Amino acid sequence: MKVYIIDYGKKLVKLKIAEFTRVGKGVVLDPFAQITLSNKDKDIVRRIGITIVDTSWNNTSQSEFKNIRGEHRRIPILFAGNPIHYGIAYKLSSIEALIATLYIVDEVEEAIKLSNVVKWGHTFIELNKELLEAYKNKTEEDIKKIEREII
Template sequence: MKLYIYHTNQCDPKKCTALKMGRLGMAKIIKNHYKIPRNSILLNPFAETAVSVEDRPIIEKYGIMALDCSWKQAEKVFKMTNSKNQRSLPFLVAANPVNYGKPCKLSTLEAFIAILYITNYKKDALSLLNGFKWAKTFIDVNKELLESYCGKTSKEIIQIQNEVLQKIKNR
C-alpha cells in the first residue's frame, strides 16, 4: 500500500504519528508540495465526497496522501496541492493520547487506519497498529462506526454519518 504524508513541520516531533510512520517505513514523508502525487486520494476534511469503497482503484494505483499540518494552515495547504481526488473521512472519534475522545480530531495514523478500514483494506489497516501502543484503541472505540462505513459508497457513508450525528444530537 502506498501511503504518503506531506509534512510541514508544524507539530511536536515527539508526538507526531506521521513522522513515526515515516521512521517505521509505513509511509513516505514528503516535504516539498510539488512532489505530492496528484492522482492519489488526498484526505481533506473540507472535501465534499467521503472516502469509500469506490476509491479502491485509485488507492491501488496511486495510493493515499495525508497532509500533516496545523489546522490553522490546513485550508491554504489543501489549495496548494491541486489534487483531483480529495476525500473526507466520516464521523469518527479520536483515540490518540493528545485528542482522546474528541470527535474528528484524528491523528495522521488514525486517518490512515480509517481510510484503509472503510475501503475494505482491513489487514492493511491493522498492520498500521504495530509500533503504536494506543492505536488498537482507535479501532475499539470506533468499531461499530468503521464496520458500518466499510464497503459502502460515498453516498451511503454520508447517510450513515448523518444518522449517527442525528442520534448524538438527540441525546
C-alpha cells in the same frame, strides 16, 4: 499501500511506511473536500496510494489543502483513540486517518497491522469498530447518511 506526506509525522517515515513529497499523489485526505471517502477510491488507493497533509484539525485552513494534486476525499465522523484527544470527533492523528482510510477501502486487514505501530492504535479501532464496520466497503451516500445520524 504507498503513503505520501506533505510538510511545509516522524513515525510512519521512520517505519518505512511513508515518504515525503512535494506533489500530492493518489487519494488526498482533505477535511475541506466535498467528496467523502468511499469504495470508489479503493483502486486509486491500491495502485497510487494515499497523501497526508501533516497538520491539526483546529489550526488548518483550506489554503494548505487547496492546490494539492490528486483526488480529494474527506473522512466521515470518527473519534480519536489516542491518549491526547480521546473521544473528540474528527480530531484524528495521521496514523488514525490512515487506519480509517484502509478500513473503508475494504482493506480492514491492513488497518490492523498499522494499528500495532502505536500502542493506542487498538484503542482507536475498538472505539469506533462497527462505526468502521458500517463504513467498510459501502458507497459514499451509504457512508454519509450514517455520519449525519450520530451527530
